[PDB]
Design an enzyme around this catalytic site. Structure first.
Site, PDB file in Angstrom:
ATOM      1  N   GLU A  96       4.520   2.554  11.906  1.00 16.56           N
ATOM      2  CA  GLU A  96       3.267   3.183  11.362  1.00 16.56           C
ATOM      3  C   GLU A  96       1.930   3.329  11.229  1.00 16.56           C
ATOM      4  OE1 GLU A  96       4.874   6.087  10.080  1.00 16.56           O
ATOM      5  OE2 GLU A  96       5.300   5.439   7.985  1.00 16.56           O
TER       6      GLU A  96
ATOM      7  N   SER B 252      -8.993  -6.524 -17.347  1.00 19.70           N
ATOM      8  CA  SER B 252      -9.856  -5.945 -16.343  1.00 19.70           C
ATOM      9  C   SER B 252     -10.814  -6.487 -16.192  1.00 19.70           C
ATOM     10  CB  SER B 252      -9.989  -4.702 -15.859  1.00 19.70           C
ATOM     11  OG  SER B 252      -8.362  -3.715 -16.084  1.00 19.70           O
TER      12      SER B 252
ATOM     13  N   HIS C  55      -3.310  -9.545 -18.273  1.00 22.19           N
ATOM     14  CA  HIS C  55      -3.622  -9.182 -19.877  1.00 22.19           C
ATOM     15  C   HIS C  55      -4.839 -10.267 -20.497  1.00 22.19           C
ATOM     16  CE1 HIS C  55      -2.518  -6.113 -21.935  1.00 22.19           C
ATOM     17  NE2 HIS C  55      -2.282  -6.803 -23.658  1.00 22.19           N
TER      18      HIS C  55
ATOM     19  N   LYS D 272      -8.706   9.514 -17.742  1.00 22.92           N
ATOM     20  CA  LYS D 272      -9.537   9.487 -16.344  1.00 22.92           C
ATOM     21  C   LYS D 272      -8.214   9.527 -15.737  1.00 22.92           C
ATOM     22  CE  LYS D 272     -13.162   6.947 -14.483  1.00 22.92           C
ATOM     23  NZ  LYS D 272     -14.388   5.994 -15.061  1.00 22.92           N
ATOM     24  N   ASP D 273      -7.435   8.585 -15.616  1.00 23.57           N
ATOM     25  CA  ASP D 273      -6.119   8.591 -14.715  1.00 23.57           C
ATOM     26  C   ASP D 273      -6.139  10.164 -14.231  1.00 23.57           C
ATOM     27  OD1 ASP D 273      -6.678   5.791 -14.390  1.00 23.57           O
ATOM     28  OD2 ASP D 273      -5.245   5.153 -15.786  1.00 23.57           O
TER      29      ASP D 273
HETATM   30  C1  HEM Z   1       2.900  -1.581  -7.092  1.00 28.65           C
HETATM   31  C2  HEM Z   1       1.122  -1.881  -6.635  1.00 28.65           C
HETATM   32  C3  HEM Z   1       0.832  -2.047  -6.895  1.00 28.65           C
HETATM   33  C4  HEM Z   1       0.388  -1.390  -8.582  1.00 28.65           C
HETATM   34  C5  HEM Z   1       1.373  -1.215  -9.314  1.00 28.65           C
HETATM   35  C6  HEM Z   1      -0.729  -1.813  -9.067  1.00 28.65           C
HETATM   36  C7  HEM Z   1      -1.665  -2.170 -10.641  1.00 28.65           C
HETATM   37  C8  HEM Z   1      -2.223  -2.345 -11.012  1.00 28.65           C
HETATM   38  C9  HEM Z   1      -2.995  -2.062 -12.388  1.00 28.65           C
HETATM   39  C10 HEM Z   1      -2.557  -0.532 -12.903  1.00 28.65           C
HETATM   40  C11 HEM Z   1      -3.851  -2.876 -12.198  1.00 28.65           C
HETATM   41  C12 HEM Z   1      -4.796  -2.377 -13.817  1.00 28.65           C
HETATM   42  C13 HEM Z   1      -5.422  -1.015 -13.573  1.00 28.65           C
HETATM   43  C14 HEM Z   1      -6.620  -1.100 -12.110  1.00 28.65           C
HETATM   44  O1  HEM Z   1      -7.145  -2.305 -12.268  1.00 28.65           O
HETATM   45  O2  HEM Z   1      -6.752  -0.512 -11.250  1.00 28.65           O
HETATM   46  C15 HEM Z   1      -3.372  -3.880 -11.190  1.00 28.65           C
HETATM   47  C16 HEM Z   1      -4.501  -4.639 -11.048  1.00 28.65           C
HETATM   48  C17 HEM Z   1      -4.986  -5.894 -10.371  1.00 28.65           C
HETATM   49  N1  HEM Z   1      -4.518  -5.038  -9.224  1.00 28.65           N
HETATM   50 FE1  HEM Z   1      -2.824  -3.955  -8.489  1.00 28.65          FE
HETATM   51  N2  HEM Z   1      -1.079  -2.954  -8.219  1.00 28.65           N
HETATM   52  C18 HEM Z   1      -0.843  -2.994  -7.373  1.00 28.65           C
HETATM   53  C19 HEM Z   1      -0.266  -3.884  -6.278  1.00 28.65           C
HETATM   54  C20 HEM Z   1      -1.582  -4.438  -6.022  1.00 28.65           C
HETATM   55  C21 HEM Z   1      -2.379  -5.453  -4.773  1.00 28.65           C
HETATM   56  C22 HEM Z   1      -1.454  -5.738  -3.388  1.00 28.65           C
HETATM   57  C23 HEM Z   1      -2.557  -6.918  -5.615  1.00 28.65           C
HETATM   58  C24 HEM Z   1      -3.822  -7.646  -4.946  1.00 28.65           C
HETATM   59  C25 HEM Z   1      -3.484  -8.063  -3.310  1.00 28.65           C
HETATM   60  C26 HEM Z   1      -2.941  -6.420  -6.498  1.00 28.65           C
HETATM   61  C27 HEM Z   1      -4.053  -7.354  -7.365  1.00 28.65           C
HETATM   62  C28 HEM Z   1      -4.536  -6.331  -8.551  1.00 28.65           C
HETATM   63  C29 HEM Z   1      -5.646  -6.981  -8.984  1.00 28.65           C
HETATM   64  C30 HEM Z   1      -6.622  -8.674  -8.866  1.00 28.65           C
HETATM   65  C31 HEM Z   1      -5.799  -6.738 -10.803  1.00 28.65           C
HETATM   66  C32 HEM Z   1      -6.910  -6.692 -11.406  1.00 28.65           C
HETATM   67  C33 HEM Z   1      -8.388  -6.247 -11.408  1.00 28.65           C
HETATM   68  C34 HEM Z   1      -9.241  -5.698 -12.450  1.00 28.65           C
HETATM   69  O3  HEM Z   1      -9.530  -5.126 -12.674  1.00 28.65           O
HETATM   70  O4  HEM Z   1     -10.130  -6.693 -12.207  1.00 28.65           O
HETATM   71  N3  HEM Z   1      -2.584  -4.987  -6.825  1.00 28.65           N
HETATM   72  N4  HEM Z   1      -2.951  -3.221 -10.819  1.00 28.65           N
HETATM   73  C1  HEM Z   2       8.028   1.345  -2.414  1.00 29.02           C
HETATM   74  C2  HEM Z   2       8.952   2.149  -2.193  1.00 29.02           C
HETATM   75  C3  HEM Z   2       9.106   2.538  -1.227  1.00 29.02           C
HETATM   76  C4  HEM Z   2       8.719   3.061   0.153  1.00 29.02           C
HETATM   77  C5  HEM Z   2       7.738   2.870   0.140  1.00 29.02           C
HETATM   78  C6  HEM Z   2       9.492   3.709   1.097  1.00 29.02           C
HETATM   79  C7  HEM Z   2       9.127   3.698   2.309  1.00 29.02           C
HETATM   80  C8  HEM Z   2      10.022   4.727   3.424  1.00 29.02           C
HETATM   81  C9  HEM Z   2       9.602   5.035   4.367  1.00 29.02           C
HETATM   82  C10 HEM Z   2       8.318   4.319   5.069  1.00 29.02           C
HETATM   83  C11 HEM Z   2      11.286   5.905   4.973  1.00 29.02           C
HETATM   84  C12 HEM Z   2      11.510   6.152   6.317  1.00 29.02           C
HETATM   85  C13 HEM Z   2      10.615   7.553   5.526  1.00 29.02           C
HETATM   86  C14 HEM Z   2      11.015   8.976   7.361  1.00 29.02           C
HETATM   87  O1  HEM Z   2       9.798   8.745   7.694  1.00 29.02           O
HETATM   88  O2  HEM Z   2      11.652   9.506   6.861  1.00 29.02           O
HETATM   89  C15 HEM Z   2      11.645   5.924   3.664  1.00 29.02           C
HETATM   90  C16 HEM Z   2      13.024   6.042   3.855  1.00 29.02           C
HETATM   91  C17 HEM Z   2      14.257   6.266   2.943  1.00 29.02           C
HETATM   92  N1  HEM Z   2      13.809   5.985   2.211  1.00 29.02           N
HETATM   93 FE1  HEM Z   2      12.632   4.955   1.042  1.00 29.02          FE
HETATM   94  N2  HEM Z   2      11.217   3.790   0.220  1.00 29.02           N
HETATM   95  C18 HEM Z   2      10.632   3.495  -1.112  1.00 29.02           C
HETATM   96  C19 HEM Z   2      11.650   3.919  -2.149  1.00 29.02           C
HETATM   97  C20 HEM Z   2      13.219   4.534  -1.818  1.00 29.02           C
HETATM   98  C21 HEM Z   2      13.564   3.813  -2.772  1.00 29.02           C
HETATM   99  C22 HEM Z   2      13.815   3.307  -4.090  1.00 29.02           C
HETATM  100  C23 HEM Z   2      15.098   4.696  -2.287  1.00 29.02           C
HETATM  101  C24 HEM Z   2      16.713   4.679  -3.013  1.00 29.02           C
HETATM  102  C25 HEM Z   2      17.003   4.557  -2.265  1.00 29.02           C
HETATM  103  C26 HEM Z   2      14.084   5.018  -0.776  1.00 29.02           C
HETATM  104  C27 HEM Z   2      15.617   5.657   0.051  1.00 29.02           C
HETATM  105  C28 HEM Z   2      15.362   5.786   0.963  1.00 29.02           C
HETATM  106  C29 HEM Z   2      15.950   5.965   1.875  1.00 29.02           C
HETATM  107  C30 HEM Z   2      17.360   6.907   1.601  1.00 29.02           C
HETATM  108  C31 HEM Z   2      15.197   6.604   3.113  1.00 29.02           C
HETATM  109  C32 HEM Z   2      15.980   7.182   3.959  1.00 29.02           C
HETATM  110  C33 HEM Z   2      15.693   8.960   4.529  1.00 29.02           C
HETATM  111  C34 HEM Z   2      14.389   8.530   5.005  1.00 29.02           C
HETATM  112  O3  HEM Z   2      14.063   8.704   6.439  1.00 29.02           O
HETATM  113  O4  HEM Z   2      13.883  10.331   4.192  1.00 29.02           O
HETATM  114  N3  HEM Z   2      13.428   4.650  -0.393  1.00 29.02           N
HETATM  115  N4  HEM Z   2      11.621   4.825   3.197  1.00 29.02           N
END
Ligand code: HEM
Ligand code: HEM
Ligand SMILES: CCCCCCCCCCCCCCCCCC(=O)OC[C@H](COP(=O)([O-])OCC(O)COP(=O)([O-])OC[C@@H](COC(=O)CCCCCCCCCCCCCCCCC)OC(=O)CCCCCCCCCCCCCCCCC)OC(=O)CCCCCCCCCCCCCCCCC
Ligand SMILES: CCCCCCCCCCCCCCCCCC(=O)OC[C@H](COP(=O)([O-])OCC(O)COP(=O)([O-])OC[C@@H](COC(=O)CCCCCCCCCCCCCCCCC)OC(=O)CCCCCCCCCCCCCCCCC)OC(=O)CCCCCCCCCCCCCCCCC
Ligand SMILES: CCCCCCCCCCCCCCCCCC(=O)OC[C@H](COP(=O)([O-])OCC[N+](C)(C)C)OC(=O)CCCCCCCCCCCCCCCCC
Ligand SMILES: CCCCCCCCCCCCCCCCCC(=O)OC[C@H](COP(=O)([O-])OCC[N+](C)(C)C)OC(=O)CCCCCCCCCCCCCCCCC
Ligand SMILES: CCCCCCCCCCCCCCCCCCCC(=O)O[C@H](COC(=O)CCCCCCCCCCCCCC)COP(=O)(O)OCCN
Ligand SMILES: CCCCCCCCCCCCCCCCCCCC(=O)O[C@H](COC(=O)CCCCCCCCCCCCCC)COP(=O)(O)OCCN
Ligand code: HEC
Ligand code: HEM
Ligand SMILES: CCCCCCCCCCCCO[C@@H]1O[C@H](CO)[C@@H](O[C@H]2O[C@H](CO)[C@@H](O)[C@H](O)[C@H]2O)[C@H](O)[C@H]1O
Ligand code: FES
Lengths: 124, 85, 54, 71, 111, 244, 383, 61, 55, 55
Positions: free
Chosen positions: G272, G206, G202, G228-229
């Site tokens: 995966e 951006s 912030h 746009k989103d």
């Molecule tokens: C849960 C995962 C993430 C969420 C929800 C998230 C969300 C966002 C949002 C809403 C913005 C502002 C809107 C946009 O530019 O798209 C943003 C900007 C940014 N995010 Fe992420 N982000 C995530 C993961 C990451 C990761 C993994 C990276 C870097 C490795 C990253 C780096 C950035 C950077 C550098 C910006 C500023 C970019 C710019 O506007 O020039 N974020 N992110």
């Molecule tokens: C970033 C958020 C998350 C990611 C990327 C994620 C990813 C995953 C993945 C990859 C699996 C394997 C799915 C399958 O092949 O069946 C899984 C299973 C599961 N996740 Fe998550 N998960 C997330 C958040 C959560 C959260 C918040 C809960 C809250 C408890 C949750 C509960 C479970 C449960 C109970 C399973 C096992 C049942 C199943 O395999 O469907 N996960 N999750």
């Protein structure tokens, strides 16, 4: 990187006849392909400005040059968002692509680098 | 480095007049056909090489590698496989 | 046409009420329409089509 | 009687004739090689799996749709 | 024969090695072995190869009797183990681990 | 790897349920259950399916209760705390042929017949793999293949040697609907049935997906109109610059 | 003064989602941020729902997932939505990171949001890995076995650490219960870091596709970016719908529908799809410890982009050589992905090594060289 | 290019009937359709999704 | 300017736990706020631990 | 010493009707009994094994 570095290295190249003979034509094509002129920018408009040094150099621009820069950035931003290019007078012609900012940033940096050097002086 | 409305941190602006019309007064899709065809063609043509070169190269690499691998694990490829291990 | 605007759109309370009532009607009719369509393209396949034998 | 039997035979004689002949020639070689003595004390024992797969893979490509059409 | 006993969820290969199997294992010069060990270091009883049947590469379980050194073959990346369960060919760095096992009786071992 | 080690990849057959808008053929599902019951169930369990799951898919409630009531299941102990059996109910799971893995392997020359409830999702290929496998036993193994003892040659099975013998022969089942029970017909039916067993929501899932596709497509179209509408002032902006 | 500005709580929402000043020229690649927010919400909603039906005991876990598929109303949908959205989360996260690398979002003044981002990416990997284990199918078990035996390569203490994480001598019930607890928790931690990287951003706002300041021409986040989103939300939900309803198992591996069996090893253990590039990097190094370090370094090396990019210009819009180099880098990252799922056989062994060298040499050699040369070309070329 | 009272050419985009009720109504029909499908979609989503919490088929048996 | 005030993230911590201006005369009953924070942390730590063992 | 005596009362009186299901033989070790005494107690009983090879 520092603009000073860029400028010094470029001067080394322009000095060497051999080097300039091969590099200056490349750099001209590079800039044609780069395509910033098609958005009505001058090269210097693209230099990163969110640094204290660059903020200072921008404050030192003459008012006219500064107002013109703001217009070029706003114009380019509008072409960007429209996905249009500049046409006609908006396209930057090679003769108009003047280094308006390089003198100012070189002065700001000159002082900043002297300051760093002098912070490390040892009375002999 | 960024401010807020009223002090965003722009150098002082002067001499630019901006004009626009209401969304209700505009055709939102004016010249969309022309843009969808001619504008997309222009923009894609300009960027084509930057996608085609790396994709074509890496696809060729993969194709060669997958075909060699397939051939090594045939009867014909027994000897070349023996050397490769 | 001004009449239509004035009645259903001008007040947001009316517009939101119109949208939700439309959503209710759409939801109900779309359900029915998809049901019939799905039964025609999958004719003689579903349990309802063979159940009569039993 | 089983529709697949006829379809497979037809596809072997027709569009997959080259592969049929490959597999056949392979089998001839391998049987003959097994017939010869000191086969059991050989380093490499040739199979016909590759040729078999080429044939089956071909037959399946020419038959799959036709077979499911008669069920 | 080779048995598979679950021990701590990992499989345990127990092979009742024949005379000629022992001989085959006692051949390979220690020098030419990623993990240099002789069968006598591995077994405390030459007729009881007891190993943790997890492959030392990533941690798949080798299928026994298969291989190229006719011991164990990891199907995952194609690593071949011996009748001592020494690594001979493939990605695996070490020989198949030996658990701490003691013969309480001559007919029963604890692991 | 050698193609042998992978197994031959099964053909893509045109299943009734392939196709975004297509359900299973329920008459095929019913026939397939009869193949499972008369052939596979000798060795393979279907542990995740309850009698109630057949109801309104393949069988009426009465037919399914009849199937359940023919079996005996473990009841709660009597008043002296002695164990008891009861007749099956619709909530009961279809019982397996073997009490445990060891019994299963002992009956199958060491090989363990897997549970079939998920086999259609648990193999690359799905229905196509099951169909290919059951129909893909050659009369004679390709010359030069050495089969391990108690193995049968089947090219679709990875490695080629499968512990399951060919089981479908013309007329091993007598279908109740007069369909000719050819090897291929029975394999098609049982493969459909097992696919249903693995994914019993399949019919409902694809209908809801059709509704979702339609609504989400409409919302996508409208969202684009709305975006362009709200953005048109910004796209249409024009400037006039007079340097000061 | 308007309530949205006056009231402290409302003002925080206002500053992020309504009056937030954005550049007026963000293109569609700036929409992945909100898609990742949508993925994170769908994963919380479906995840918490599955947790209400899932049993973390190893004797019952796999069965509980079958119960979800077969007995729970719409359980099939919640399960497939959760499993597929994990794939879409990685498509969006790679896209978002790709956007950030191409447009130089990692440069000053945005090094902090970038660096926090790299940590979000690690937490997402850990979260998704643990979730995969919870099913307790064959890929679940053999995944946890392989991955946690890499920790054994940490010298001296590695073995001890593994047994401590497993809670036992092998992957089994203790491991499954603890992964359930952590997999539930980690998404909340991930949400907090997502929020921190936005708060960090912030200060600068951006970046934009031209790489110039936007201070000259700002647009409120709402309504312009709100609407746009929605376009990409509906586009995403269309793709989601095609997978979840029509092909729910296309992105997965059938081996996970076989219950975990510590004896039988599955045909092929591949992770995966979204982990595959890092897996290929690990395979490239023959040494076990080397491989693990390389695999971690392949993620942490992103932290040095702010140093090794020497350009005076932010982003690649105007840099033809950098664009070509970036194209090669991205395609190589996909080839690494593909090499993660082939068998360790010739000629893929050598190829995997070359692609791994190319991956690292982008950050260490090429990007510093290319960015230096382009600086000189811009200056000489515009004289 | 100099006079700021000479509004740039917007004739490519200006609607002739821009101040009619017909005109506004159309755009609100688009917004309202979008709100209608969103409402119908949210109802469907919520109802289907929360039904997971109702007795499952094994319980109902 | 000091880092704790300059940097956006640090500044938020600073504004709540370090430079936050408080009345000089809060008595011991103003300490329950931080005890409730401690309870909430102990409950998260023990709770997440029990979740790793609970079925 | 009381705990050990108490175990003997449980074993000779209460265990006729009451279970002690949450206590394993290992729990007595180093509390009431040596490892040898406890193994002796366990080895006097028969428990359900995994099925034999015929299942
Ligand atoms: C849960 C995962 C993430 C969420 C929800 C998230 C969300 C966002 C949002 C809403 C913005 C502002 C809107 C946009 O530019 O798209 C943003 C900007 C940014 N995010 Fe992420 N982000 C995530 C993961 C990451 C990761 C993994 C990276 C870097 C490795 C990253 C780096 C950035 C950077 C550098 C910006 C500023 C970019 C710019 O506007 O020039 N974020 N992110
Ligand atoms: C970033 C958020 C998350 C990611 C990327 C994620 C990813 C995953 C993945 C990859 C699996 C394997 C799915 C399958 O092949 O069946 C899984 C299973 C599961 N996740 Fe998550 N998960 C997330 C958040 C959560 C959260 C918040 C809960 C809250 C408890 C949750 C509960 C479970 C449960 C109970 C399973 C096992 C049942 C199943 O395999 O469907 N996960 N999750
Ligand atoms: C996944 C979840 C689903 C959600 C959908 C999100 C995807 C949207 C997105 O970010 O990409 C669309 C995105 C459209 O974004 P945009 O805001 O129109 O322009 C962004 C660029 O400035 C556009 O760059 P440009 O103005 O230079 O035009 C380039 C583009 C033409 O852009 C288009 O309008 C298409 O064409 C290509 O580069 C195609 C490559 C040639 C291969 C033949 O399409 C591309 O840019 C594709 C090129 C990527 C490589
Ligand atoms: C449970 C968790 C463990 C954590 C401990 C936290 C408890 C600390 C706390 O908030 O109370 C201490 C607190 C001492 O706090 P302080 O900051 O010195 O003065 C707070 C009062 O406003 C100052 O009150 P004051 O200056 O008017 O002094 C009143 C106090 C005298 O305060 C003394 O400490 C003596 O004596 C009484 O009110 C006793 C009533 C007669 C009993 C016969 O104890 C009380 O004053 C108790 C009065 C409640 C009735
Ligand atoms: C496949 C390889 C992609 C190479 C892209 C090269 C540029 C190009 O042609 O793209 C079009 C456009 C070009 O846009 P642009 O903003 O440079 O140009 C706009 C128009 N001008 C020049 C007039 C200002 O590039 C993008 O939009 C690139 C976004 C990158 C996303 C990559 C995700 C990959 C995941 C890997 C994770 C690590
Ligand atoms: C998530 C569920 C979303 C369901 C939306 C319910 C109906 C509301 C709606 O469509 O909003 C239209 C309305 C009106 O859109 P509007 O604000 O463009 O219309 C105002 C101008 N008049 C009154 C003349 C039409 O938006 C709202 O009231 C905001 C609520 C949406 C959240
Ligand atoms: C949480 C998970 C988010 C993922 C949503 C994708 C679609 C899932 C909806 C479930 C579904 O199958 O609904 C179908 C219709 O889809 C649709 O029409 C839904 C697609 C519409 C997009 C979503 C719009 C808002 C959704 C999110 C808001 C939820 C919370 C806010 C209060 C058919 O099901 P059916 O029609 O038989 O259903 C009974 C009512 N007749
Ligand atoms: C729980 C366990 C508490 C143990 C931590 C106490 C600190 C140990 C001694 C260190 C110390 O006294 O030095 C100060 C560090 O304290 C600090 O910087 C912290 C001061 C007090 C510690 C924790 C603050 C509690 C406030 C809220 C409680 C929240 C409970 C909710 C979880 C710095 O001394 P100085 O900084 O004054 O200057 C002096 C010149 N440098
Ligand atoms: C009398 C024994 C027997 C009969 C009858 C039998 N099976 Fe099997 N089946 C097995 C055994 C044993 C295996 C394990 C084979 C192996 O792993 O080598 C097996 C394996 C399978 C597999 C999995 C192969 C794999 O990829 O792991 C499927 C699918 C299968 N059977 C389906 C069927 C169907 C469908 C039928 C009949 C309609 C059937 N089986 C009849 C014994 C039988
Ligand atoms: C405000 C925070 C919390 C409060 C007030 C709280 C309260 C409680 C209470 C009162 C019990 C019953 C205790 C008993 O008599 O055994 C309990 C049990 C439990 N809590 Fe929490 N809890 C909190 C946070 C958490 C969290 C974050 C978790 C994370 C999972 C959690 C996991 C559990 C578990 C697993 C149990 C059951 C095991 C047990 O009873 O000890 N708790 N909690
Ligand atoms: C604040 C929000 C208000 C409370 C939210 C209410 C939560 C759940 C209420 C309804 C859930 C059960 O309500 C029930 O929904 C399911 C599907 O969703 C419907 O079920 C119908 O459609 C599904 C698929 O869409 C079919 O599998 C089913 O055979 C058919 O009858 C029932 O016709 C309805 O009676
Ligand atoms: S895991 Fe054993 S060979 Fe790689």
């Amino acid at each position: 990187a520092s603009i000073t570095s860029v400028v010094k290295t470029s001067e080394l190249i322009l000095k060497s006849p051999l080097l300039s003979k091969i590099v200056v034509p490349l750099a001209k094509t590079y800039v044609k392909f780069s395509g910033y002129r098609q958005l009505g920018f001058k090269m210097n408009d693209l230099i990163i400005e969110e640094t204290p040094n660059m903020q200072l150099a921008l404050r030192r621009l003459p008012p006219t040059e500064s107002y013109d820069r703001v217009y070029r950035l706003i114009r380019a931003t509008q072409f960007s968002l429209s996905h249009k290019l500049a046409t006609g007078n908006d396209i930057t012609k090679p003769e108009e692509d003047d280094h308006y900012l390089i003198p100012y940033i070189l002065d700001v940096e000159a002082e900043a680098f002297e300051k760093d050097a002098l912070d490390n002086l040892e009375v002999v | 480095y960024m401010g807020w409305w009223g002090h965003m941190g722009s150098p002082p602006q002067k001499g630019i007049a901006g004009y626009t019309i209401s969304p209700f007064a505009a055709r939102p899709f004016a010249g969309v056909v022309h843009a969808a065809i001619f504008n997309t063609f222009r923009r894609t043509k300009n960027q084509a090489l930057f996608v085609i070169l790396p994709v074509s190269f890496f696809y060729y690499v993969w194709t060669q590698a997958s075909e060699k691998n397939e051939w090594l694990y045939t009867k014909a490829g027994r000897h070349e496989l023996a050397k490769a291990l | 046409a001004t009449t239509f605007y004035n009645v259903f759109v001008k007040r947001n309370s009316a517009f939101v009420a119109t949208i939700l009532a439309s959503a209710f009607v759409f939801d109900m009719t779309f359900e029915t329409a998809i049901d019939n369509f799905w039964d025609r393209i999958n004719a003689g396949k579903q349990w309802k089509d063979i159940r009569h034998k039993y | 009687p089983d529709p697949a039997i006829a379809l497979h035979e037809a596809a072997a004689e027709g569009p997959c004739h080259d592969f049929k002949h490959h597999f056949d020639e392979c089998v001839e070689r391998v049987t003959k090689a097994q017939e010869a003595e000191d086969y059991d004390h050989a380093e490499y024992k040739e199979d016909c799996v590759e040729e078999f797969f080429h044939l089956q893979h071909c037959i399946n490509d020419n038959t799959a749709d036709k077979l499911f059409r008669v069920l | 024969k080779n048995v598979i006993i679950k021990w701590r969820g990992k499989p345990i290969f127990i092979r009742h090695r024949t005379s000629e199997e022992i001989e085959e294992a006692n051949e390979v010069n220690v020098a030419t072995l990623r993990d240099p060990q002789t069968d006598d270091e591995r077994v405390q009883k030459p007729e009881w190869l007891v190993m943790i049947g997890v492959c030392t590469h990533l941690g798949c379980v080798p299928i026994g009797e298969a291989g190229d050194f006719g011991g164990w073959f990891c199907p995952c990346h194609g690593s071949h183990y011996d009748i001592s369960g020494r690594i001979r060919r493939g990605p695996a760095p070490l020989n198949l681990e030996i658990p701490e096992y003691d013969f309480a009786d001559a007919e029963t071992l604890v692991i | 790897m050698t193609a042998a080690e992978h197994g031959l990849h099964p053909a893509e057959y045109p299943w009734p349920q392939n196709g975004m808008l297509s359900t299973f053929d329920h008459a095929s599902l019913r026939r397939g259950y009869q193949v499972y019951k008369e052939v596979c169930a000798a060795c393979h369990s279907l542990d995740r399916i309850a009698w109630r799951n057949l109801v309104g898919v393949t069988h009426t409630t009465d037919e399914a209760k009849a199937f359940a009531e023919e079996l005996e299941y473990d009841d709660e102990p009597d008043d002296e705390g002695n164990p008891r059996k009861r007749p099956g109910k619709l909530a009961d799971y279809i019982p397996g042929p073997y009490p445990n893995e060891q019994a299963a392997r002992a009956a199958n020359q060491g090989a363990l017949p897997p549970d079939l409830s998920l086999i259609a999702k648990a193999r690359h290929g799905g229905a196509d793999y099951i169909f290919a496998l059951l129909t893909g036993y050659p009369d004679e193994p390709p010359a030069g293949v050495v089969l391990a003892p108690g193995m049968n040659y089947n090219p679709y099975f990875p490695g080629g040697g499968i512990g399951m013998a060919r089981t479908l022969f013309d007329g091993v089942v007598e279908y109740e609907d007069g369909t000719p029970a050819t090897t291929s017909q029975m394999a098609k039916d049982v493969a459909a049935f097992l696919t249903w067993a693995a994914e019993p929501e399949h019919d409902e899932r694809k209908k809801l997906g059709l509704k979702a596709i339609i609504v989400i497509s409409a919302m996508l179209g409208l969202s684009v109109y709305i975006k362009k509408f709200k953005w048109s002032p910004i796209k249409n902006r024009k400037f006039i610059y007079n340097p000061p | 003064m308007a309530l949205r500005k006056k009231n402290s709580l409302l003002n925080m929402a206002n500053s992020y989602v309504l009056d937030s000043p954005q550049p007026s020229n963000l293109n569609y690649f700036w929409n992945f941020g909100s898609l990742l927010a949508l993925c994170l919400v769908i994963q919380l909603a479906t995840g918490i729902t599955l947790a209400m039906h899932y049993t973390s005991h190893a004797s019952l876990a796999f069965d509980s997932v079958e119960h979800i598929m077969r007995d729970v109303n719409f359980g099939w949908f919640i399960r497939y939505a959760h499993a597929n959205t994990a794939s879409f989360f990685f498509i969006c996260i790679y896209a978002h990171m790709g956007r950030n690398i191409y447009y130089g979002s990692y440069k000053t003044p945005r090094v902090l949001p970038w660096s926090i981002g790299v940590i979000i990416f690690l937490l997402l990997i850990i979260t998704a890995f643990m979730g995969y284990v919870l099913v307790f199918g064959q890929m679940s078990l053999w995944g946890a076995t392989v991955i946690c035996n890499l920790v054994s390569a940490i010298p001296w203490l590695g073995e001890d650490i593994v047994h401590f994480l497993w809670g036992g001598f092998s992957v089994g019930n203790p491991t499954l219960q603890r992964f359930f607890a952590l997999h539930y928790l980690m998404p909340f931690v991930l949400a907090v870091f997502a929020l921190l990287h936005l708060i960090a951003l912030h200060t600068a706002g951006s970046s934009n596709p031209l790489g110039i300041t936007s201070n000259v021409d700002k647009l409120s986040m709402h309504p312009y970016y709100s609407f746009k989103d929605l376009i990409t939300v509906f586009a995403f939900l269309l793709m989601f719908t095609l997978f979840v309803f029509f092909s729910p198992d296309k992105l997965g591996h059938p081996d996970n529908y076989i219950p975990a069996n510590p004896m039988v090893t599955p045909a092929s253990i591949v992770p995966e799809w979204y982990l595959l590039p890092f897996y290929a990097i690990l395979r490239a190094i023959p040494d076990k410890l080397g491989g693990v370090i390389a695999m971690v370094a392949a993620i942490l090396i992103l932290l040095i982009l702010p140093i090794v990019d020497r350009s005076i210009i932010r982003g690649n819009a105007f840099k033809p050589i950098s664009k070509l180099l970036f194209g090669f880098f991205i395609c190589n990252f996909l080839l690494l992905g593909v090499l993660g799922q082939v068998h360790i056989e010739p000629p893929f062994i050598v190829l995997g090594q070359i692609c791994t060298i190319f991956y690292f040499s982008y950050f260490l050699i090429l990007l510093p060289m290319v960015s230096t040369i382009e600086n000189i070309f811009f200056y000489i070329g515009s004289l | 290019g100099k006079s700021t009272y000479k509004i740039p050419d917007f004739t490519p985009y200006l609607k002739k009937d821009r101040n009619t009720d017909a005109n506004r109504l159309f755009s609100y029909f688009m917004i309202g359709s979008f709100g209608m499908l969103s409402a119908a979609g949210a109802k469907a989503t919520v109802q289907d999704f929360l039904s997971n919490m109702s007795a499952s088929a094994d319980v109902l048996a």
